[PDB]
C-alpha cells in the first residue's frame, strides 16, 4: 500500500488549491477504510481536513 501525492507546490493567494492522491496496492471501493487528507503546517501540529466514502446506507 502506497500513497502518492501530486499537484502544484506553488499556488498564489485567493486562488483555488487542487491536489490529487494516487493510491497503489488498494482499492478505494473497499469499505474497510475512509479516504481523506491531513495537513501539517511547517513546525506546527497535525490538523484534520476531512474524509469521505461512497459506501452508503439506505438514506
Amino acid at each position: 500500500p502506497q500513497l502518492q501525492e501530486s499537484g502544484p507546490t506553488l499556488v498564489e493567494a485567493s486562488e483555488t488549491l487542487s491536489l490529487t492522491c494516487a493510491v497503489s496496492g488498494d482499492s478505494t471501493a473497499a469499505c474497510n477504510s475512509f479516504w481523506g487528507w491531513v495537513r501539517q503546517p511547517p513546525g506546527k501540529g497535525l490538523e484534520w481536513v476531512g474524509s469521505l466514502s461512497h459506501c452508503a446506507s439506505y438514506w
Binding site: 501539517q40 513546525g43 501540529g45 497535525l46 484534520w48
Partner: protein, 204 residues
C-alpha cells in the same frame, strides 16, 4: 487535546507521555521523524499495529490517555502526536510531545540579541533577532518583553535544528514598527530552557 511540550530520557529508561481531553477509547498516538511522514505507533488505546515493538503501550485512565515507551533507543527520537474521535465523527489532534534520545552531555543555551540596524530603520522597519544555540534538549520556548511588560505581537519562532557539533540551535524573529522601538528604551528577550531561563536586553 493537551500534550506536554517536551520529554527526555536516557537509553534503556522508560518514558510515559500523557494526553487529556479524551472521553472515549478511540485514542491513538503517532510518531513523526523530522523531515519525514508521521507513522501510527498505536491505535484503540493499548492495541499495537504490525511491525511495532512491544515496548510501545497505550493506556487511558479517566479523561487522561497515556503512551509508554520502554527501552529507549536512537530511532525513538521524534515528535509524538495523540489523536482521538470526538462526538459523532470529528477527530482532533494534540499539540504533540517532542521526545529526544540524543547523546550526552546537557548544556545551557547561549543567547545573542541583535537590535535593528541603522539602514533598516531608514526602510521604516524594525526587527530584533534572538539567536539561541548550544542547548540540550532540542526544544526551547522563547519569550519577548519591552521594558517590563511582555510582548505578544510580532513573534515568529521556528523549530530548532541540529548543528555540526550535535548541539541544537534556533532563532526567533520579532518584527515591529520603528515608533514603538524608539519609544521603549530597552527590549528584553527571555529564553526558557528546562525551567531555567536566559535573558538578553538591548537599548538604543
Amino acid at each position: 487535546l493537551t500534550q506536554p511540550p517536551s520529554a527526555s530520557g536516557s537509553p534503556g529508561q522508560s518514558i510515559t507521555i500523557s494526553c487529556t481531553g479524551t472521553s472515549n477509547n478511540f485514542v491513538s498516538w503517532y510518531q513523526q521523524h523530522a523531515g519525514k511522514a508521521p507513522k501510527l505507533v498505536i491505535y484503540d488505546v493499548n492495541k499495537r499495529p504490525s511491525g511495532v515493538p512491544d515496548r510501545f503501550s497505550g493506556s487511558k485512565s479517566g479523561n487522561t490517555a497515556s503512551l509508554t515507551v520502554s527501552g529507549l533507543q536512537t530511532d525513538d527520537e521524534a515528535v509524538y502526536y495523540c489523536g482521538s474521535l470526538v462526538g459523532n465523527w470529528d477527530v482532533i489532534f494534540g499539540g504533540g510531545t517532542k521526545l529526544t534520545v540524543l547523546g550526552q552531555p546537557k548544556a545551557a543555551p547561549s543567547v545573542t540579541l541583535f537590535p535593528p540596524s541603522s539602514e533598516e530603520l531608514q526602510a521604516n522597519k524594525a526587527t530584533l533577532v534572538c539567536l539561541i544555540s548550544d542547548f540540550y534538549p532540542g526544544a526551547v520556548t522563547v519569550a519577548w518583553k519591552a521594558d517590563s511588560s511582555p510582548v505578544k505581537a510580532g513573534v515568529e519562532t521556528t523549530t530548532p535544528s541540529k548543528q555540526s557539533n550535535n548541539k541544537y540551535a534556533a532563532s526567533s524573529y520579532l518584527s515591529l514598527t520603528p515608533e514603538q522601538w524608539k519609544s521603549h528604551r530597552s527590549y528584553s528577550c527571555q529564553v526558557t530552557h528546562e525551567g531555567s531561563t536566559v535573558e538578553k536586553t538591548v537599548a538604543p
